[PDB]
């Protein structure tokens, strides 16, 4: 919205919080399954 | 008679387990016949190992009942016995005789079950000496001894955690200072997340019986010194304590996350019980107590949510009065309420995973098991959202 | 560990006398009256050997882990396995 | 109490073969065939009478109320009747 800081803070801060939740959720999902899969490598070569 | 060679033959290695079988099956065969809805389910107490044991936590048996570790903080009632008391019992046979005795060499404080193991039991002590037991046989010696240096703990392990799966066998041991140490459940040498719960204020967080989110979520809620619901994560961008949603008072003696969903949503809610003489409802969007319950007469110690009906908790107090409430059914009053022997200051409450029965622990020994046969299969999601809306309309003026 | 063993064995209510009969057939370590049950357990060792041959030869997949002898006068709730036969005579009520 | 009860009792919850002995040694009458009755209950009856002869040598008419030999895969119960003895194979659980 022509990056005006009034609505910027006031409502676009909540919009940024919304962006954090799309991103935060994605990151959490990646971390949970990535840990469980990469921590279960077959061998050192399989780990590579 | 003279039987030393028969002590080696008869009382051999594998024959001691057979003798345990003989004693167990004949002592179970003692239930021989002739050879011509408040109901108070059961109660158990050892008059030699549970006697006057001033304890604060044990190791209940939600899954696989009728065998639950009574990891007692061994009092000086029996100084001529191994200092440490852990007692699995036999609710299936309903006995209190000292058959499944278990002991250590220190004050056994909350020796929970190990990860992926019913026989292996993990447990911290007063000096943070986490010991372990692999009872594949019928043994009782603590086979593990944790190092106790500067990075380790020397304070009571409040509530140790088991995080992950067969890949990640993590253990979170915490002292009174709040030092978290994620010992691997295989080697007792290096704790992975061996850090400090750094928070906005008072980084040396005086934790007090924290609680573990359902669904392997790391967004824990640490119970602390004055309520102080420390909401955070162990790792990520907020490895330390992110914030402290509070409004509860005193050292938290009972806090529990969401129960087992009957027919409701996930219901990202929890509750707290402490020295404020009450329990206070909470969720993930409050920062204040969602619903402070009745500040009963005395220190409300433990509280626990039921799995059958997810929207109902149970709480005892400083005057031993268990009050199980389902505000979606019984709002101003508890669903069921019954006292304990006399009016003492208990410390634990734990719902049976089967539901409609509960094993409540006293802080001086004996464990009571009450029975409440009321709930059936019902869609309580409707009543859940409706009561949340009623609270959302009551708080306004 | 003879402590917990003998403890939970003789300490059990109404237990008159156990017989931990080994392959030898003599109950030198038990709570029965040894001068009276020695020959009793030896004869019963031979006849329980007959019983082992019976139960394990007609139906070879059937062992003998608990022998609840419900008699007209005593509860001989024997505790066996492939190693012993705890012939225990116990008070009925 | 004969036909439906016979099916109810032979293939009962646990009862493998209720092979009632006919005249204390020669099992003929039963709720099933004669081989499983005669062979099984006769040898188990004879060898159990030998063990009872030993216990009988200790104390003679102290017979068995209901000898529930809880053998591993299928129990063997011996309940002495008048014309015969009871040699029945019935599982413990």
From Swiss-Prot, chain A:
- According to the UniProt entry, the coiled-coil residues are 9-32
Q: List the disulfide bonds.
A: none
Per UniProt, subcellular location reads as: Cytoplasm, Cytoskeleton
Domain of life, per UniProt, equals Eukaryota
The free-text domain remark for this protein reads: Dynein heavy chains probably consist of an N-terminal stem (which binds cargo and interacts with other dynein components), and the head or motor domain. The motor contains six tandemly-linked AAA domains in the head, which form a ring. A stalk-like structure (formed by two of the coiled coil domains) protrudes between AAA 4 and AAA 5 and terminates in a microtubule-binding site. A seventh domain may also contribute to this ring; it is not clear whether the N-terminus or the C-terminus forms this extra domain.
The entry's function note states: Cytoplasmic dynein 1 acts as a motor for the intracellular retrograde motility of vesicles and organelles along microtubules. Dynein has ATPase activity; the force-producing power stroke is thought to occur on release of ADP. Plays a role in mitotic spindle assembly and metaphase plate congression.
**UniProt similarity note:** Belongs to the dynein heavy chain family.
Q: How does it assemble?
A: Homodimer. The cytoplasmic dynein 1 complex consists of two catalytic heavy chains (HCs) and a number of non-catalytic subunits presented by intermediate chains (ICs), light intermediate chains (LICs) and light chains (LCs); the composition seems to vary in respect to the IC, LIC and LC composition. The heavy chain homodimer serves as a scaffold for the probable homodimeric assembly of the respective non-catalytic subunits. The ICs and LICs bind directly to the HC dimer and dynein LCs assemble on the IC dimer. Interacts with DYNC1LI1; DYNC1LI1 and DYNC1LI2 bind mutually exclusive to DYNC1H1.
- What name does UniProt use for this protein? Cytoplasmic dynein 1 heavy chain 1
Which portion of the entire protein is included? 535 to 582 of 4646
UniProtKB/Swiss-Prot annotation, chain B:
Q: Which residues form the signal peptide?
A: none
Work out whether the entry's keyword set contains Cell cycle.
no
Q: Which GO terms describe its molecular function?
A: dynein heavy chain binding; dynein light chain binding; microtubule motor activity
- In terms of one coarse class, where is the protein primarily found? cytoplasm
Q: How is it modified after translation?
A: Pyrophosphorylation by 5-diphosphoinositol pentakisphosphate (5-IP7) promotes interaction with DCTN1. Serine pyrophosphorylation is achieved by Mg(2+)-dependent, but enzyme independent transfer of a beta-phosphate from a inositol pyrophosphate to a pre-phosphorylated serine residue.
Q: Which UniProt keywords apply?
A: Acetylation, Cytoplasm, Cytoskeleton, Disease variant, Dynein, Host-virus interaction, Intellectual disability, Microtubule, Motor protein, Phosphoprotein, Repeat, Transport, WD repeat
Task: Enumerate the Gene Ontology biological process terms.
Answer: microtubule-based movement; transport along microtubule
GO CC: one term?
dynein complex
Q: Where in the cell is it found?
A: Cytoplasm, Cytoskeleton; Cytoplasm
Query: In which ranges do the WD repeats occur?
Result: 50-99, 103-143, 152-193, 202-242, 247-292, 295-335, 341-380
Q: Which residues form a coiled coil?
A: none
Name the associated disease, please.
Neurodevelopmental disorder with microcephaly and structural brain anomalies: An autosomal recessive neurodevelopmental disorder characterized by global developmental delay, severe intellectual disability, microcephaly, dysmorphic facial features, and cerebral malformations including simplification of cerebral gyration, agenesis of the corpus callosum, and brainstem and white matter hypoplasia.
The family line of this record is:
Belongs to the dynein intermediate chain family.
Q: What is the name attached to this protein's record?
A: Cytoplasmic dynein 1 intermediate chain 2
Q: What organism does the record attribute this protein to?
A: Homo sapiens
| Name of encoding gene | DYNC1I2
Query: Which part of the full protein is shown?
Result: 208 to 624 of 638
From Swiss-Prot, chains C, D:
Q: Which organism is it from?
A: Homo sapiens
Tell me the compartments it is located in: Cytoplasm, Cytoskeleton
Does this entry carry the keyword Transport? yes
Q: Which SMART domains match?
A: Robl_LC7
Query: Which protein family is named in the record?
Result: Belongs to the GAMAD family.
Q: Which GO terms describe its cellular component?
A: centrosome; ciliary tip; cilium; cytoplasm; cytoplasmic dynein complex; dynein complex; membrane; microtubule
Record's keyword annotation contains Zinc:
no
Its tissue distribution reads: High expression in heart, liver, brain and pancreas; moderate in placenta, skeletal muscle and kidney; low in lung, prostate, testis, small intestine and colon. Isoform 1 expression is up-regulated in 64% hepatocellular carcinoma (HCC) patients.
Functionally, this protein is described as follows: Acts as one of several non-catalytic accessory components of the cytoplasmic dynein 1 complex that are thought to be involved in linking dynein to cargos and to adapter proteins that regulate dynein function. Cytoplasmic dynein 1 acts as a motor for the intracellular retrograde motility of vesicles and organelles along microtubules.
Q: How does it assemble?
A: Homodimer. The cytoplasmic dynein 1 complex consists of two catalytic heavy chains (HCs) and a number of non-catalytic subunits presented by intermediate chains (ICs), light intermediate chains (LICs) and light chains (LCs); the composition seems to vary in respect to the IC, LIC and LC composition. The heavy chain homodimer serves as a scaffold for the probable homodimeric assembly of the respective non-catalytic subunits. The ICs and LICs bind directly to the HC dimer and the LCs assemble on the IC dimer. Interacts with DYNLRB2. Interacts with DYNC1I1 and DYNC1I2.
What InterPro entries does the record tag this protein with? DYNLRB1/2, Roadblock/LAMTOR2_dom
Q: What is any one GO biological process for this UniProt entry? A: visual behavior
Q: Which UniProt keywords apply?
A: Acetylation, Cytoplasm, Cytoskeleton, Dynein, Microtubule, Motor protein, Transport
> What is this protein's record name?
Dynein light chain roadblock-type 1
The molecular function GO annotations come to: dynein intermediate chain binding; identical protein binding; microtubule motor activity
């Amino acid at each position: 919205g022509l990056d005006v800081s009034k609505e910027g803070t006031e409502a676009w801060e909540a919009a940024m919080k919304r962006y954090d939740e799309r991103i935060d959720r994605v990151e959490t999902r990646i971390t949970a399954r990535l840990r469980d899969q990469l921590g279960t490598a077959k061998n050192a070569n399989e780990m590579f | 008679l003279t039987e030393e060679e028969k002590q080696q033959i008869l009382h051999s290695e594998e024959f001691l387990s057979f003798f345990d079988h003989s004693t167990r099956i004949v002592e179970r065969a003692l239930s021989e016949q002739i050879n011509i809805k408040l109901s108070l389910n059961r109660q158990f107490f050892d008059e030699r190992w549970s006697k006057h044991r001033v304890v604060s936590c044990l190791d209940w048996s939600s899954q696989y009942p009728e065998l639950l570790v009574a990891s007692y903080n061994n009092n000086e009632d029996a100084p001529h016995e191994p200092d440490g008391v852990a007692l699995v019992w036999n609710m299936k046979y309903k006995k209190t005789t000292p058959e499944y005795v278990f002991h250590c060499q220190s004050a056994v404080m909350s020796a929970t079950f190990a990860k992926f193991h019913p026989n292996l039991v993990v447990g911290g002590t007063y000096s943070g000496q986490i010991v372990l037991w692999d009872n594949r046989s019928n043994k009782r010696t603590p086979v593990q001894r944790t190092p106790l240096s500067a990075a380790a703990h020397t304070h009571p392990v409040y509530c140790v955690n088991v995080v992950g799966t067969q890949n990640a066998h993590n253990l979170i041991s915490i002292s009174t200072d709040g030092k978290i140490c994620s010992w691997s459940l295989d080697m007792l040498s290096h704790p992975q997340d061996s850090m400090e719960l750094v928070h906005k204020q008072s980084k040396a967080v005086a934790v007090t019986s924290m609680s573990f989110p359902v669904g392997d979520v790391n967004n824990f809620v640490v119970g602390s010194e004055e309520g102080s619901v420390y909401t955070a994560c162990r790792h990520g961008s907020k490895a330390g304590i992110s914030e402290m949603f509070e409004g509860h008072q005193g050292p938290i003696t009972g806090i529990h996350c969401h129960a087992a969903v009957g027919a409701v949503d996930f219901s990202h809610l929890f509750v707290t019980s402490s020295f404020d003489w009450t329990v206070k409802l909470w969720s993930t969007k409050n920062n204040k107590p969602l619903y402070s319950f009745e500040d009963n007469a005395g220190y409300v110690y433990d509280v626990m949510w039921s799995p059958t009906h997810p929207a109902l908790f149970a709480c005892v107090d400083g005057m031993g009065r268990l009050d199980l409430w389902n505000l979606n059914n019984d709002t101003e009053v508890p669903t069921a309420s019954i006292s304990v022997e006399g009016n003492p200051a208990l410390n634990r409450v734990r719902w049976t995973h089967s539901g409609r029965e509960i094993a409540v622990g006293d802080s001086e020994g004996q464990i009571v098991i009450y029975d409440v046969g009321e709930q059936i299969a019902v869609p309580r999601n409707d009543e859940w959202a409706r009561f949340g809306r009623t609270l959302a309309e009551i708080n306004a003026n | 560990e003879v402590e917990e063993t003998l403890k939970r064995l003789q300490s059990q209510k109404g237990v008159q006398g156990i017989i931990v009969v080994n392959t030898e057939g003599i109950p030198i370590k038990s709570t029965m009256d040894n001068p009276t049950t020695t020959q009793y357990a030896s004869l019963m060792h031979s006849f329980i050997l007959k019983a082992r041959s019976t139960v394990r030869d007609i139906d070879p997949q059937n062992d003998l882990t608990f022998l609840r002898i419900r008699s007209k006068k005593n509860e001989i709730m024997v505790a066996p396995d492939k190693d012993y036969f705890l012939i225990v005579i116990q008070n009925p009520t």
